[PDB]
Structures are given as C-alpha cells and as structure tokens.
Symmetry: D2
Subunit: 479 residues, 4 copies
C-alpha cells in the first residue's frame, strides 16, 4: 500500500521533515507535513452535550407478533420482518474521558432503517425521568454537570435542584436503587419512556409505551465493584459489549408495547403524558412485538459511533408523538444539536443515512454536500416538471385539544404516589436499605439546608424513607 | 413521480400547509416536516471564496500528444495519447457571488487533473504574470481591490494608492488594462500557470518550466462598451456562454505547452527567473507542445461540482514540484488552509475534490463530516509492524543547496519596467496603446490627485509617452 | 504612526518581504508574521444571508410622539418623547452579495429597537403583503427566485411555474411589478411590518395591529430604464445614496403608525386577518400616529455593523406579541436558527446585536466564542436557592383559546383575487396599469408557453382586462 | 435578584413551564423563550483540544528578579522588579475531557505572559525532553497513545509498537515511568520550555537557551497505588488541589531560570543541541536565575478562562525567538492552526487570549464572530499613504545562515542511548531503577511478545541491567497468565 497525501500524491518519506541543512529550519514546501498536521489539528468535533460516553453495535429488529391493528408502520408490517438497526449505549453526565461503571441513567438509542425512512427510538434504561417539562432540562443537566467556576462535580447543585423540584422523586429513587449501575449494557432494559401514538391503516389511534427487555437478564454492579472498575477499566461497558459480539455471544432484547386507548388515557389516575409516571403493568400489560439483536461490531468507532445521530422526531407513518411536553421539546432539540455537533448535512453521514429509503425532496446545498445534491431535479414545490410529490397516506392523525394556548404549571402534579408504591411495594427491605444508603452517601456532601428540604420530600413519599435517610445523614454530618 | 420525504426519508403527507391549532391558530413544534425543510434552507450557504468568488465550471479531459518524459516523470505525461480526466473552473477576482462576468479583472483558469498519482491542480489564470512578487502583500492587494471597510463601496483611492506605492505592478496593470482585460467569455482566452515550476524526470534530473494552454478557439475580447452593456443585460454572460457551448457539442479546448529553462539558464536569465512579474520570452524559451485540454461535460449540479470544488497549488504529483518563487511558495499554504475554512476539515472527500483515480492511504483519521470507512480499523500510527501504508522512495522530492542566510530579502530592487516597455512598444500597436491609456485614465481619474501623480510617475518610468498621454487624459477628466 | 503587530500583539519588523533561505530560496515556516496574516485573510468570509444578502445599513433612534399606552404596555412606547436607539438594514431579496441594488425586487427594511426590555426586532419590508401565506412554501419560492440548480442562471420558468401554480401570489406580484417595484433608493420607500401582530396593555387587554413607517422623504421610484442604467453604472447605488445622505446630515426619517383591529373586528373581517396576502383597508382601519424613525449615523466598519447584524422577528418585548399568521409563525423559528449558522451560537454577543440597554441575565452558558465573563460563577440552574435571576410574572404572555383540530389546513384556495382586483382597478390609474402589464409581460415572456398560459389565466381571474392585455403584449414577444 | 431574560434581554414571565395548546396539548413554536434557551444549550460544546484535553487553570504574575538583559532585549525582562501578568493551564496528555488527573503521563505547563510587546506563550511540560525529535511523527505518536480506532479502547500494542520501532523515545520514556510520571498535583512539579530557543540582545547578539521553572513548593509524586485509588475517588484531584490552594492563600510559585549556550558552544555540543530528546547538563550549562512565577488567582468561570484559553508557541516578542529544533519548528504551525479549528478564526478576541497589555494594530480584518470594532475605517491595505500602522525595524528577527541542501534529513539514528544511560545509572538510585523497571513491565506486559522483544532489546542498548530486569519481570507476568 502506497502512503499518500490527502490528495493521493505518493509520499517519499514521512518520518523526517524538509529542512535547510541537517540542523536548519522547517520549510513551507514540506506540504506532506502540513497536510497531515492540519488534519490532525482538526480531528476533534464537539462531544454530545449529554450522553457523551458511549458504546455502539449493529444488528436487526425482527417482528414476532402482529400489532398491525395498532400501527400501520412498515417496520411492523408483517410477522418475521427484519429491519436493520444501529444501537448506542451511554451514560449521561460524564464527558468523553469518564468511566462507564458509575451511577447514572443509561442511554439506549435504537435506529431502525425502514423503507418509510429511519425511525429513531431514543430511550434509556428507565421508564421514567427526573422532570416533566422540557424547559427545565438545560438547568437539570447543568446541575448534574460541573460547577461553572471550579469545574468540579457539585452535590450542592445536584440536590438544590432536586430538592426544589420534588417531581424528581420517582426517578431519583430508581437511579439510586441497584439499577443505578448496570453490569454493562447487555444487562439492562430499554424504554422509550415517553408515551407515543400508534396509528393503524384505518386511521384510528392509541397511545403506547415501548419496552425492550434484556434477553440476557438484569444484572447490576455493587458500588464497591463499580468503583473498583471505574479505575481499573473506565471503558468496561465498551469492552464488554464489543467482546460479546466479537465472540459470537450476540445480545438481544425482547420488544413489547403497552397500549392505552384514548379513553383509558382519561380514566388513568394521573397525566398519561407525564414522564415521571409509569403505566402499571398489572393495568396495562406488555404486548409482544419482536426482537432486537446486536450481531455486528463497528469497524471504525468515530465513523460509526461518535458520528451517529438519533432524532426522536424521526418517526414513520404509524408512529407519532404524544402531547408529552418532554418529548415535544425533544422533537426540536436533537436535529438542532446535530446540525451543530455534526453539521448541517449530518444525515449524509453513512450511519445516519436513511439507506433503505428513497430520499427525495426540495432541499439543496449546505456545507459538505456529499451526494449529487439531487442533480438538476427541479428545486421548488409545486412544479410542473414531475419532481417528487407528497403522499396523502402519510398525513398525521389529527386531534382536537381544548384550552387556552398558555403555560400550564405541572410542578404540582402528583409527585409522590407512584414513588410510594415503588418504595414499599416494588422494592424489598434490602433494596430499600441500600436505596437509603446510596442517597445518603451522596446527599451528605450537600449543604445542610439543602439536606433538610431533600429529606422533607422523601418524607412525603414515606416517613420511613426520609427518617432512615436522615439517620445516615446524621451519622455522616457527625464527622 | 418520486415520493416526497423529509431528510430522514419519512414520507410527507402534505408539504404545502403547515400544522396549526385550528385553521387560524399558532404553529406547532411537532410539525417536524416544516422544521426539517426550514432548518436546511436556513443552512444552504457556505462562505464564498475569499477571492475569485464568481465562477463557472465544466469538465473533460487532458490528452497527451507529445513526449516530454525526458523532463518530467509525472504519470499524467507517461505515454502519448493518454487521457486524464479534468475539472475546470473559470472566474473573475474582486467581485462577489452576484457580480457581473464581463468586467475588467484577471480571469482564474484552474485545472484539476485526477491522476493515478493523485490530483494535480494547476491553479492559474489568463495572464503569465501578476501584480506583486511577494506573497505577504497579497491580502493588502486584494483588500485594495475589494470594498472600502466603511462605505462598502468600490474605492479607486484604495486601488491606485496601493498600485502606485507598488510599482512592480506596472507589467500586470498594463496587461490588465489592455484589450485582454475583458475576454469574451472563458472560451476565448489563454491559461498560464504563471509561476515557474520544477519538473523532474526518472533520473532525478530537474528543470524549471512554465505552463501555457492556448485557446484553440482563439483570443477574442469585448469592447468596454459591450462589456458594460452585458454586465447589465447578462451578469452571468460567461457562465451561459460556456454552458451553451458544451451543451450544443461545441466543446472548447486548449493546446497545452511548457517552456523549459535549465538550472544553468536560470542563472543567466537577465532577471529573476522566479519573479512573478516577469515572463520567459518565447524567443529564448520556446513553447514545447505537450497535450490538449477539452471540456465536453457541463456540471449536473453547480453547487456540488462548482461552488464546492477546491484547487490547491500544493497538489502536485511526483514529477512536478514547486520553484523558489515567493508567491507560489505562499500559495502552497493559503489554499488548503482557506479550504479547510470554506469547505471544512474534510473537503477532500467532497466528490469533485476526491482523488478518485488514486488510492489514498495514510494515517489521517476523523475530523468533522468523515464520509468513508475512515480507513476502518487499519493501524493509525506510522511506523508500525502491522503492515499499513508505506512511504515510497520514488516520490522523494528534488534536493538543492541554497546560498545566503535565512531572513527577509527586499525585492523592491527588482526591475519594474524593462519588460513592460517591451510590451508597451513592441507587443502592442497604436490602437491598443491608446485604448490602454484611455482605459487606465477612465479608472485612475477617480483617485485623489496626489495618487494620480504617483501613478503617472510610474507609467512614465516605463515610457515617457506612456505616462504623459495618461496625464493628458487625466487633465481633461480633472476638469 | 502605530506599531504594526501580529494578531498576538507582537511588533512586525518587516511585513513587505517574507522570510526565505537566501534571496532566491524557498519560504520558511518560522515566518509566523506571514502565516498569521495569511491565515486570517483566509477566513475573512462568512456565509451571506440566505435571502436579502445584498444590503445597506445605518443607525439612529426612534422617538415616541403620540400615546398608544392604551394599546401597549411595551416600554419603548412608555411615554411621549421617549427615545430608543435603532439599527436598520435595507436590502434586496434574490440577489447575492455582489448584485445590483437598482433591480426589481421587494426591499427589506429591518429595524432593531434597543429597548430596556431587551431588543425588539421589527423585520419588515417595503410592502404590506407577500406572495405566499404559508411558511412551508417559502424555501421553494426562494428557490424559484434564485439560480437554476444546474446552469446557475436566473430562470424564468422557475419564477413563473411557481407563481402560476400558486395564484395567492397575485396581490404581491401586482405590487412588485408596479412602479413601487424599484424605489429610488432606500430613503424614498415606505416600511411595513406586513404581518398582523398583537399588542397588550397593562391591563392584559389585547388588540391586533399592523406596523407602518411612511417615508418623510416622499415616495420616489426609478423607471426600468434608469434602474437598468444604474445596475450597470453603479451596482451599489442604494448604498452610496443612504450613506451620503447621512454623511452630509440629510438624515432620513419615517413617521411610525399602527393600524388597530379589536378581536371583535377580527372575527367580522371579510378575509383572514392573519393572511399575509391581505391588507386592512385604511378606510376601515386608519393609521394611528405613534412615533418617528430617524437614521443619523452611518456604519464605521460595514462588516462589523451591517454584514454581521442580525434581526430576529421573535425578538419582541412585553406589550408586543405574535399573531397566529402562519408566515410570521414560521419566521419565529427561522431567524435565530439561520443566525446560529451564519454568525454562530453566540451571535448575540456581537456588539450590534447585543441588547446593551437591557440587563441580560439567565442560565445559558458556554458555546463557541463565549465573549463575556460568561456570567461568572452565578448559579447556572433554575430554580436555585442562591439568588440567581428570577422570572417576573408581569412578562407572561397573553392567553387565547383557539378552536379546531391540530392539523394542516389548506389555504391555497383562500381569496386570491378580490383585494387584487381592488388594487388593479381602484389604486392604479391607467398609466400605471399599462406599465404594470408591460413590466409583467416583459419578464413572463421568457417562460415556456404552458407556463405563460396558466399565468395569464390567473391575471384574467383578477380582471379580464388585466389578463387579456398581458396576453396581447406576450403575443408580440412570442411573435 | 435580577430579572431573568432570554438572550435578547426580553423578560421571562415563566421559565418553568412551556406553552401548549391546552393543559394536555402539544408544544408551540411561539414559545421562543424555550427555543432560545434550548437552542443555546444545544451548542455549549466546542471541540476539546486534540491533546492535553483535561486541564486546570490559574492566573498570576511573573516578576523579574535578576538582570539578563545582556542576553535578551525582551521587555518582559526589561528590568529587575518588573511584573507581568500571566495565565497558566496545567494538563495531562492522552486522556480526554472526562479522564482522571492522577495517571502516568506527561503534564502540560503553559504560561501566557501578557507583555507590552504582545503575548509570549511558553507552552512547556514537566519534563525537559520528549519522545520524538521530528514533528512528522507527532500525530502518529499521539494516535498510538490514545484509543484503538475500532474498539475505542486503550491499546498497549499500539503504545509499545510505536515506542519499540522508535527507540529515540528511550530517554523521555525512562522519565515517564520514573517516580515523576505521576506528580502529586500541579503545584509539586517543575516546568520546562524543553525546546532550545534563541535569545537576542539590544546589540543583535544572539544566544541559545532553555527555560526552566522549578517548583518552589518542592518536587512531590504520587505512588502508583494512591494514583489509582485517587483516579477513582477524585478524577479531578489536580483541579481541586490547585483551586483550594489558591482559594486558601497557598499561592504556588516557581523560580524562573534559563540555560545559555553560545553559538560557539553549540557547534561543539556532543549532540544536536536542537534535539528534543537531549538535555544540556547543568554541570556544563549552569541554570541562570531570572525571575519568579506566582499563581494567586483562580478562574471565575472555567469555560471562559480555561477551556477557551489558547497558547501558541509562535507567540514570541522581540528578544525571544525559535531555534531550528525540528519539533518546535512544527509547533510554530500546529497551535494557531488547531486553535482556528477549536475556537475560531478570531479566537484571539476571546478575553484570556487577547494581548490586552499590548496595542494590536494591523491589516487583518473580518472573519466570523468579529467582536471588536474591526479596527473601524482605518485603511486596510499596506502600504498606504494614509498613516495606518507601520512596521518598526527594531522588531526584525535575528538572521543566521545554514549549510546543507533543502531536503529531509533522517535523524532516527542520532544518539538514542547515551544520555539515557546517564539518567539510569547516575541520576537514579537503586530504589528508583527497580520502580522504573516495574512500572515499565507492568504496562508493557500487555503488549504482544514480539513487541516485547524489540522493546527490551532497546532498553538493553541503554544498559544490560535495564533490559534484563524488565525481561525478568515480563516473564513472570507472561507466565502468570
Ligand atoms: C500569493 C498569492 C496568492 C494567494 C495567497 C492566493 C490565495 C487565494 C485563496 C486563499 C483563494 C481561495 C480559494 C478557495 O477558497 O477556493 C484563491 C483562489 C484562486 N486563486 Fe489565488 N492566490 C494567490 C495568487 C493567485 C495567482 C498567481 C493566480 C493564478 C495563477 C490565482 C488564481 C486563483 C484562482 C483560479 C482561484 C480559484 C480557486 C478555486 O476555484 O478553488 N491566485 N487564491
Ligand atoms: C415565512 C417566510 C419567511 C421566512 C421563513 C424568512 C426567512 C429568512 C431568513 C432565514 C433570513 C436570513 C437572515 C439572516 O441570515 O440574517 C431572512 C432575511 C430577511 N427577511 Fe425573511 N423570511 C420570510 C419572509 C419575509 C418577510 C414577509 C419579510 C418582511 C415583511 C422578510 C424580511 C427579511 C429581511 C429584511 C431580511 C434581512 C434580515 C437581516 O438583515 O438580518 N422576510 N428571512
Ligand atoms: C511536534 C510536537 C507537537 C505538536 C505538533 C503539538 C501539537 C499540539 C496541539 C494541536 C495542541 C492543541 C492546542 C489547543 O487545542 O489549544 C497541543 C496542546 C498542548 N501541547 Fe503540544 N504539540 C507538540 C509537542 C508538545 C510538547 C513537547 C509540549 C511541551 C514542550 C507540548 C505541550 C502542550 C500543552 C501544555 C498543550 C496545552 C496548550 C493550550 O492549553 O492551549 N506539546 N499540542
């Protein structure tokens, strides 16, 4: 193989630079050096604003059951249908150099390359989240990140925000339970979290929840181990995933959904669209749909993992968004941030390209335009020259909403009920004790006035929750 | 007719109406179709070329007709009858993207050769010489030619102040204001590499050279009157003329020659052989026919194949190297540098720029908008024991020893008039000399009178009649 | 004089000769002075605006002359005699950065009011109406107005195939091809907010409005002949005229008025009061005097104060809000979006864009080129228990409840002729009608006949004489 | 409490709830308060430095304590007692933005002196030498120190394949694996310009030199164990230490020296004086005291003052110039180039990069995010008959003449063991050598065996004991598995 410059010019020697004499200065004509150096100098792009640390693999999605009565989406079109998928696992707060085995939620994004375009299901390992209004997401994330002056993690920031926004109770509980630190990516479940809308061939709609359970089973790391691992192998999650697939132990998840008719959405105790709530299985049981199988490792991490981009707004006919405020905000945020992190034409990047689909429209140009830019095809719509036409079949399902167009406060929607049921029913005493210790061990670094409001909140879920945490805190502050 | 889609390939039910709440209500964020299309339109523009922004493009090939292997081992020259695909871009200089084509200004005539040894870019224009002989005055030169930093208007004071303060411009200024100043479209003008380059053959022997490609359609210019009229009637006269031609099968071509000056002759040349304000008289350095340039294919999409194309003088395949000309030396850096800005870090992946006849292989990786496999998992460090791309000793550059110390050498002492008088008195006949003086006076008349004097003194240093006739004309205007 | 430095503040000894190895040797990399200046010159360009690229800017102030506090609580109108600094930019539409000013096209008349309640951006133009009334058609309309994607030439088929398939364009097209189509410079044209907006008073009561700013210098237009001559003679006519006036003290001004329409009146309105293709008859909704716009200072550096300026329709202070106009609605997103692309994430830090008479404070941080103290160490999350900025309830937005389903509502078939027939028959006299048909036909004749047919079909719909006369003229052209 | 606003300064009524059509309806585009804040959130990340990504910043001053004017006319040295404000950024090399501070790896030690003659950046590390001596191998070396291009995991075969095929590295490698590989915080390590620079006096006379700033807080390193326990307990240890130190009055300081080698001495140095893998023995070239560096102020906002800070070795004011050191010659280009990418064309306008103690005037204009007045209406072309800024001849660079032709001269074979043997036997005590061999074996034992052979091969060239002690260890390891 002949070593070349970016323009393909053979290189004579790329181990020594051109100089005027053996001990003289460097010359501009040594374009070989500059060409390489200039590229080295531009190797980095900005990391994801959140979920920066990640692992990636590829595979397919396979339909196992008929749910066409609910969704007309081609990805579900017929039993046994296989569609290629791209998956990206990740943590949340930490940046590119951080450890994988730390307490944090886990991203679990799945990209389906369907013939009706790509369908990005950007979920995580928890069915719920910390807040229910997108406008608090930047603040939340800031509080989870580094102090603006010291650039250090700040318990005060974390808990002042959480104590002031108690709706964070439900997810804060899930996050500090054993599931706060899964043993790798293959031993956790995935959830779309938000409520989405399914539409069938008949134009009738229903609301759903997406779920994909680990076929390898749930397995978590104790805090002792997680800590040891955060230092022995910060990239433990990446290694584990890549070695499994590499050795043929292809991990898979069983994909189900929960269905809620519009009526049920009403009789539902709470706001069905509040991200801090779940749909109790007992009441809305899981419906089998298919499998997700990861059977291929990336070849080039930067090209296939760092540059991949998932947009919740990527939804094909049969799948639509619900009124969930959080999701509504995510419809804008992802493409927006992608045009920034990656570039105006990031969808032309191989992994983000909707290759099983025929992309035709009236969009043109932009930096780094790679394709033919759709040749000389007429660029305005409508036109009398046979350019791409719109197709009615893919029209969105319309609903009539009532009320004024204003800001409705949801800070006071139920913040503790489901949290109680999870604390006293779902968990057992061990889990319950640990839950308290993990919270206590982290909250203890916060200022006391913050510690106090935090505990009041936990007390509202259950006096035992708060009081036991308060006990450990006392122990901690005793020192 | 194709099915209309979003960038992610999702079918669009209706792209003529936006989603609102009620027929006369606000716009919805979930109308992802609108945002997708709008966010792209919003990013359709990249920055124009800092200079030579207005252009035209066409494609074809270069075919070798004569054997010059004795001078250069470049593959593009390898054997007679050999065709090498080429991309060309014609352009003006000062004007920006919407300026008129038929105006006095030099003309860019850039040629890209997709050779097996990588791309070879010959970035030249319709003149053998330039206005200055040191790269460091180029930005100031261009500034003086563009708009006033405040009024944002053309400034004759900036134009002639700089020229009169830099008398080395006499030669090019004289060519610029001659009939050749406004070629009748790109098909009727010549092309030159202007700079002296270095050719190396298979024995390691080298000579200096000049590249010329004479228009096989013949020299044909526009009267200033016509030029003015077309600038109003058809600002893109050049683009249209080039395009109709090729589209109607009247493929324009140029005969490619080279002038050779041995290293010994380089010493005995009257002037500095590397001074860009000088030419190599044919009378002493005959044109040697080499091949032909033929443009037979119009671009399919202008943005993709013309606006985005990038030519780098540093792109020279084994056999062709740079000379110590200061100007060329400076351009060795400017182009890829500005290209990494205008197009992006990975601009060489954009199709028209990709060296597709070559086999690129190196240790460069990542960068924004990485398009290929990013060289997969191949070892990314050199040297290495895992058999990656090797450097080949054949392509090693020509070696030479130089006299003197490393520091800035004043070149304002170089002749500024000798060849100019030659051009004024011999090369041009009465008619022309007159239109020449008239063309200059019509532009210099607008400059402050003290500048007019500094300039006349220069035209006088060439020939007394040259300066005085201009002053005669100026006196009229100044009244 | 001042010592010449590199950008880093290092003194330059000689910036007229580059460092080379000997008088006739190659260029050195340690000539950082050269690289530094060249690297910057290489990045002077940024993308020009996607539309309204060719512009002229100035500065001045707004002064309240009358009292409208009963309609709006906005501080800028707070009390008679109150003055607010303004920034303004006039412009054409389709032409790119180097096009001619004196050509047929609408004219942007953007006004930035630097108020204590933050910047208020009134982005309007010389017409009260527009060609389309749904933002999703904009990119196509603009495309059809610019160059052919392949030949890169102005294309009459694209212009008329679009306008003929979308007759809602009739009104603004009749206005554009009338005398008002080519105002004699920026100072002799009116300014309009075009869109219907909403005003809110201190009591929470709201009304709809139209913004108007009539030229005190009187309406003056250029004949097509003059326009042509000038596009040739002086492509930057509009720039020079504005600049010279202010330079000599002939400060241009505009009387600012508003038309008011109560919500009751909004219901009874014959058309859709938020339809961008329609006006509110002065007879039924008279102009109410408000203040004065005065431009008394030219820019000192064009690139910094004009090219880099950015107006966002979504920049509206309390007392001023958006109406449901689909067009306005989309613009709320498009500008800050395109601005983050053309200028960058922190384009609001650029001096001309900074709301300097306001006290910006929030939880936003970082981003490319953060130019301030980035709000120091203040709490970067909301809410917080550390006295960081708090939302003030009085700035809440006005609440309305709309009726109907959330879906795309076709408006292509709204009224496209009535108000046009009024303008053609009532407003214009015969000299004007003649000239209008001549101007239209003169451009419509370059279009293919089927395109011509459909066009004349719509004009005939407005009035049999309008359509028939054009046809007549066309017949001569096709002959 | 100030009023909360959008980026355009418009007051925000409610920034805790978004606008929807009804309490259970979709989100509206007209809620621009939301979009304005969300849009910015979506952009707060810029590219991290390609190397030395993880860092810590602080500010203070440089004070002249001795007179070295006979060597340099640089104003920063102008006279005894003269103080010049400075900015410093410490860092590691390989790890990216979230990596741990306490890990074996060199440490960046950048100093920006805002002088009257412009800024002077002395971008050095905590070592006098480096792994390679030709800039064309730097990208390769860096790639080998980072993640596998496919697995994205650290890769020992990559690390050692490079170091074994490029033995010139032996010197700095022997240092990187010594106790000084993991300093205890940034306050207990030395600072070196490393490269050989050139000093010029008011007479035009020039000399070559080495800059050194010794830690007044004294040398101090972390044991491998603490370094690891720490990489887990506090991955930001270095930042916290430096910050608290300064916040509690423990302002850290360094003493600034220089070594001078005349041109005559230079032609007789047993090695290439401009070889980044060599040092000038203090015995033959005594350290000359010059001044002092003091860090007494912490940043107010890290992003603005630290992540956005940019140092360019090419930023040198009159009196200070570069030497023909191949490595340094390369960096003269890399930094401004990379900065244009990382920060932006006008990255010099960012406050901490601005040469605020100097008076910037030239013919450069425009570019994205032009923050200043863009030098108003001043004439933008040079020369001009309108007064605009002028070159001052006194600032002209020092000129030398070199012998030889213009080409690539291999240096892969210059001395690779001599100076290293000195360090191994003379400099280090028995204790140290053992720890050295151990820290090497512990990391190299993961590399393939053929890579191991070649690596040991070279260590042997430095000293039979060196190589055998490592091999001895490699065997036990390779056996254990
Ligand atoms: C030292 C002097 C010069 C410098 C620093 C220089 C710099 C530049 C730069 C930065 C560009 C922008 C390229 C792009 O953005 O694509 C440009 C374009 C161009 N220059 Fe030069 N130039 C110099 C002299 C000349 C001369 C001597 C000629 C003709 C032989 C010339 C012909 C062109 C042409 C044809 C283009 C169009 C390139 C393209 O389409 O990519 N320039 N020049
Ligand atoms: C729904 C249709 C419209 C959309 C989406 C839209 C979009 C745009 C965009 C993206 C720009 C670029 C601004 C920049 O780069 O700084 C722009 C500029 C401009 N537009 Fe619009 N526009 C629309 C309708 C109109 C209308 C109806 C008016 C006024 C009545 C208008 C007046 C202008 C002006 C004056 C500029 C120059 C702005 C500046 O100098 O910053 N546009 N428009
Ligand atoms: C030929 C070898 C070298 C090249 C081409 C090179 C290249 C680079 C580049 C591109 C950066 C990124 C700067 C930024 O993004 O702001 C960097 C950072 C850095 N380098 Fe080097 N480097 C080289 C050798 C070294 C050496 C031996 C030292 C010290 C003497 C060193 C110390 C640093 C430090 C401390 C930083 C931090 C700079 C900052 O904070 O702006 N590098 N280097």
């Amino acid at each position: 193989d002949v070593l070349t410059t970016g323009a393909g010019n053979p290189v004579g020697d790329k181990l020594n630079v051109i100089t005027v004499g053996p001990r003289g200065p460097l010359l501009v004509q040594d374009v070989v050096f500059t060409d390489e150096m200039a590229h080295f100098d531009r190797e980095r792009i900005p990391e994801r604003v959140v979920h920066a640390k990640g692992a990636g693999a590829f595979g397919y999605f396979e339909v196992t059951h008929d749910i066409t009565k609910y969704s007309k989406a081609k990805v579900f079109e017929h039993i046994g249908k296989k569609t290629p998928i791209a998956v990206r696992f990740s943590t949340v707060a930490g940046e590119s150099g951080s450890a994988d085995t730390v307490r944090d939620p886990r991203g679990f994004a799945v990209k389906f390359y369907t013939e009706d375009g790509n369908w990005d299901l950007v979920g995580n390992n928890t069915p719920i989240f910390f807040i229910r209004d997108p406008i608090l997401f930047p603040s939340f994330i800031h509080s989870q990140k580094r102090n603006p002056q010291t650039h250090l993690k700040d318990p005060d920031m974390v808990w002042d925000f959480w104590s002031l926004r108690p709706e964070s109770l439900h997810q804060v509980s899930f996050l500090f339970s054993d599931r706060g630190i899964p043993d790798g990516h293959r031993h956790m479940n995935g959830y779309g979290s938000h409520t989405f809308k399914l539409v069938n061939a008949n134009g009738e709609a229903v609301y759903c929840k997406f779920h994909y359970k680990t076929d390898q089973g749930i397995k978590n790391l104790s805090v002792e181990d997680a800590a040891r691992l955060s230092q022995e192998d910060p990239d433990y999650g990446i290694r584990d995933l890549f070695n499994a697939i590499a050795t043929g132990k292809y991990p898979s998840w069983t994909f189900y959904i929960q269905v809620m008719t519009f009526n049920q959405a009403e009789t539902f105790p709470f706001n069905p669209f509040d991200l801090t709530k779940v749909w109790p299985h007992k009441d809305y049981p899981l419906i089998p749909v298919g499998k997700l199988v990861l059977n291929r490792n990336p070849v080039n991490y930067f090209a296939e993992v760092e540059q991949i981009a998932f947009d919740p707004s990527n939804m094909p006919p049969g799948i639509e968004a619900s009124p969930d405020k959080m999701l509504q905000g995510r419809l804008f945020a992802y493409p927006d941030t992608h045009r920034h992190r990656l570039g105006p034409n990031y969808l032309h990047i191989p992994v983000n390209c909707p290759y099983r689909a025929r992309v035709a429209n009236y969009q043109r140009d932009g930096p780094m335009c790679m394709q033919d830019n759709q040749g000389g095809a007429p660029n305005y719509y409508p036109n009398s020259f046979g350019a791409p036409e719109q197709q009615p079949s893919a029209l969105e399902h319309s609903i009539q909403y009532s009320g004024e167009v204003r800001r409705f406060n949801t800070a006071n929607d139920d913040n503790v009920t489901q949290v109680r049921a999870f604390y006293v029913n779902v968990l057992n005493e061990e889990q319950r004790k640990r839950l308290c210790e993990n919270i206590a061990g982290h909250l203890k670094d916060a200022q006391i006035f913050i510690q106090k409001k935090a505990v009041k909140n936990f007390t509202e879920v259950h006096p035992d929750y708060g009081s036991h945490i308060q006990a450990l805190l006392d122990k901690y502050n005793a020192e």
